[PDB]
Design an enzyme around this catalytic site. Structure first.
Site, mmCIF file in Angstrom:
data_model
loop_
_atom_site.group_PDB
_atom_site.id
_atom_site.type_symbol
_atom_site.label_atom_id
_atom_site.label_comp_id
_atom_site.label_asym_id
_atom_site.label_seq_id
_atom_site.Cartn_x
_atom_site.Cartn_y
_atom_site.Cartn_z
ATOM 1 N N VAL B 47 0.791 -1.211 -0.088
ATOM 2 C CA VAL B 47 0.092 0.023 0.133
ATOM 3 C C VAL B 47 0.858 1.225 0.119
ATOM 4 O O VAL B 47 0.408 2.416 -0.225
ATOM 5 C CB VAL B 47 -1.006 -0.088 1.142
ATOM 6 C CG1 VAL B 47 -2.134 -0.971 1.053
ATOM 7 C CG2 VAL B 47 -0.352 0.087 2.610
ATOM 8 N N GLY B 48 2.018 0.878 0.191
ATOM 9 C CA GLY B 48 2.808 2.399 0.098
ATOM 10 C C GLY B 48 4.467 1.871 -0.076
ATOM 11 O O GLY B 48 4.917 0.707 0.260
ATOM 12 N N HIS B 152 4.326 5.916 7.974
ATOM 13 C CA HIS B 152 5.263 5.008 7.664
ATOM 14 C C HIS B 152 6.165 5.331 6.578
ATOM 15 O O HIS B 152 7.446 5.387 6.626
ATOM 16 C CB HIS B 152 4.184 3.589 7.307
ATOM 17 C CG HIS B 152 5.083 2.522 7.085
ATOM 18 N ND1 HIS B 152 5.433 1.320 7.732
ATOM 19 C CD2 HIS B 152 6.441 2.343 5.854
ATOM 20 C CE1 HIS B 152 6.216 0.470 7.255
ATOM 21 N NE2 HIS B 152 6.731 0.955 5.975
ATOM 22 N N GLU B 153 5.678 5.767 5.724
ATOM 23 C CA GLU B 153 6.387 6.302 4.343
ATOM 24 C C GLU B 153 7.385 7.633 4.411
ATOM 25 O O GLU B 153 8.440 7.397 4.055
ATOM 26 C CB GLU B 153 5.322 6.440 2.938
ATOM 27 C CG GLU B 153 4.639 4.832 2.367
ATOM 28 C CD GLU B 153 5.752 3.678 2.422
ATOM 29 O OE1 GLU B 153 6.969 4.074 2.262
ATOM 30 O OE2 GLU B 153 5.460 2.548 2.729
HETATM 31 ZN ZN LIG Z 1 8.076 0.599 4.616
#
Ligand SMILES: [Zn+2]
Ligand SMILES: [Zn+2]
Lengths: 189, 193
Positions: B47-48, B152-153
């Site tokens: 997802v990222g 997170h990203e």
């Molecule tokens: Zn990561």
């Protein structure tokens, strides 16, 4: 033989119970100790704790041999103060440091397959407890043997190395030899 | 040639990425990097993705959570995680800030740490400023799962991985994801909101 339990199994993350010292010589405990030694030697690895085979008891086994040490270059063995020691069994081990001297090196664990991280450990420790036969013992250890003792005693309190590793050092086994990132402390003592 | 995902240990993951010159975002060179990230993300699938994860030391993130991906997760989990589909997003030079003190705890993975998950506390509500893939100045307001993915990203761009900010005793193999949390671990979920 029991399989080595992987991270996530609650037994690994829970506090292990003391063994009744008078029961150390029993069939049940001797069998757990026998299983631990065989499992350790099969992996192979230098240390194992009872929770790693799904047994919630305060038992560790450990050894380092000329053979194991032969898989590392002389220069690494020297730096790590890594030296052979005979098979050790400790029931209800209690560990304390002997000084404030510390060293930082990469560690792994059979319950965390495929990774390593840099972990700061005491260089000198003393561990009291009982041996395989239920006799009281006191072990004084330094260098790599001391690190192994701390790693394995940590397992008895439901503690894995990944929760006390130096930030930005966690890595795959294949990436073991890559440099440490900007700002990481250097390996050694 | 499509780059491979870089794994934990490679210093590009663990050091601070540099800003893209805003005037260069529209260039073929940067567009290629962004197209590579999108293909790598969709290939995983995940997802990222952040640029250091393909060995590019730049401040770029891409993210996407499709109706299809979401269809696989339990209904109760989707509800708890406030996980809603969102179209493909690219941000260059993102700057993330929380919009409240409200937090949530759920399991995360990272393609750069193959085979493991752990519980990580995140802000529930964030705002991110930056540039889109055409170099236009944008602001993105996110909550729930999308907010988490953004955090997170963005963390990757400062050389930070989830494993160094995870709740102790929750690290686990993917196969053991659903096993009970040990005593003393906080329960998964979110602050009232
Ligand atoms: Zn990561
Ligand atoms: Zn271990």
């Amino acid at each position: 033989l029991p399989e080595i339990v992987a991270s996530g199994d609650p037994v690994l993350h829970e506090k292990a119970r003391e063994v009744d010292p008078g029961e150390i010589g029993s069939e049940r405990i001797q069998k757990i100790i026998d299983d631990m030694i065989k499992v350790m030697r099969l992996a192979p690895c230098v240390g194992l704790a009872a929770p790693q085979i799904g047994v919630p008891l305060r038992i560790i086994v450990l050894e380092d041999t000329k053979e194991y040490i032969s898989y590392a270059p002389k220069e690494e063995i020297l730096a790590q103060e890594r030296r052979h020691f005979d098979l050790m069994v400790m029931v209800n081990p209690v560990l304390k440091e002997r000084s404030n001297k510390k060293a930082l090196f990469f560690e792994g664990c059979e319950s965390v397959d495929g990774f390593r991280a840099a972990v700061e450990r005491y260089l000198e420790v003393v561990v009291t407890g009982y041996d395989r036969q239920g006799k009281r013992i006191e072990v004084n250890a330094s260098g790599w043997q001391a690190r192994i003792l701390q790693h394995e005693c940590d397992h008895l309190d439901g503690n894995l190395y990944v929760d006390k590793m130096v930030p930005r050092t966690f890595r795959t086994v294949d990436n073991l030899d890559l440099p440490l990132a900007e700002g990481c402390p250097k390996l050694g003592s």
